[PDB]
Design a protein around this ligand. Sequence first.
Ligand SMILES: O=[N+]([O-])c1ccc2oncc2c1
Ligand SMILES: O=[N+]([O-])c1ccc2oncc2c1
Lengths: 130, 130
Amino acid sequence: VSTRETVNELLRRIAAGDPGRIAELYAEEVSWKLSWPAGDHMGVVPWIQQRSTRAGVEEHFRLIADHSSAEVFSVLVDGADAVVLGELRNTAGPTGRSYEAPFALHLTVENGLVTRHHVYEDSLAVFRAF
Amino acid sequence: VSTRETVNELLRRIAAGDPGRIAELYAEEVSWKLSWPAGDHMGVVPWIQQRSTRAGVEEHFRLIADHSSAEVFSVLVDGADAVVLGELRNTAGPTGRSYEAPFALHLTVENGLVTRHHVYEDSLAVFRAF
Ligand SMILES: O=[N+]([O-])c1ccc2oncc2c1
Ligand SMILES: O=[N+]([O-])c1ccc2oncc2c1
């Protein structure tokens, strides 16, 4: 079924929290990218690290939940590709500092499965929270 | 004419540099957003500041040129809205430090004019270059 249907189902599963069910939406192999410097992968902001498979995606959603709300402004869809436009308004577990990060979430869907997850977000604001 | 045609014309005018001609593509009033913290607008990275009108957009393109290449991976179009996905690979004028920032450029087009320009990019990588 559709690219847009797949994405809306992803947003609702993400809003609902269960990481295993979130990962169920993801392809076995996943292209995972983040607008964070190479050298700061697995740095002070802990989820920032490279990922490659569904199980990796699962561990990611378990980890943002360990270390808060989110608004979705729009969802642009153009074929197999989509961009979720919103804002993260969370608070960093360790430092206690509350932060807001605008994000654009780029997704690709093939056969109802997410094959790409590329986050573009205010990396410096998140970083200063940690 | 189309949303996608308008955008491709913007990319080519940007690649060609002339700021006045770049701004000619922009609406009189423009919604201008950046994935940078509020408190760092007009900070050490100098173009990071709020903008509101065509002339503001023009000064922006004069300023990134004062203070290097760019690749466009894709352009997603969904109605009046588009997202340009690429990477900035420039080098900071003052510090000499070379940087790479992935970006997603969100655009809205109305009557062939850009009314919104919302950049989502690796703010921390740019920031560390300055
Ligand atoms: O879930 N994500 O795609 C995601 C990925 C990286 C992030 O940094 N800050 C919030 C955030 C969210
Ligand atoms: O031109 N832009 O939309 C833009 C806006 C903000 C930027 O920060 N680093 C590169 C960059 C480019």
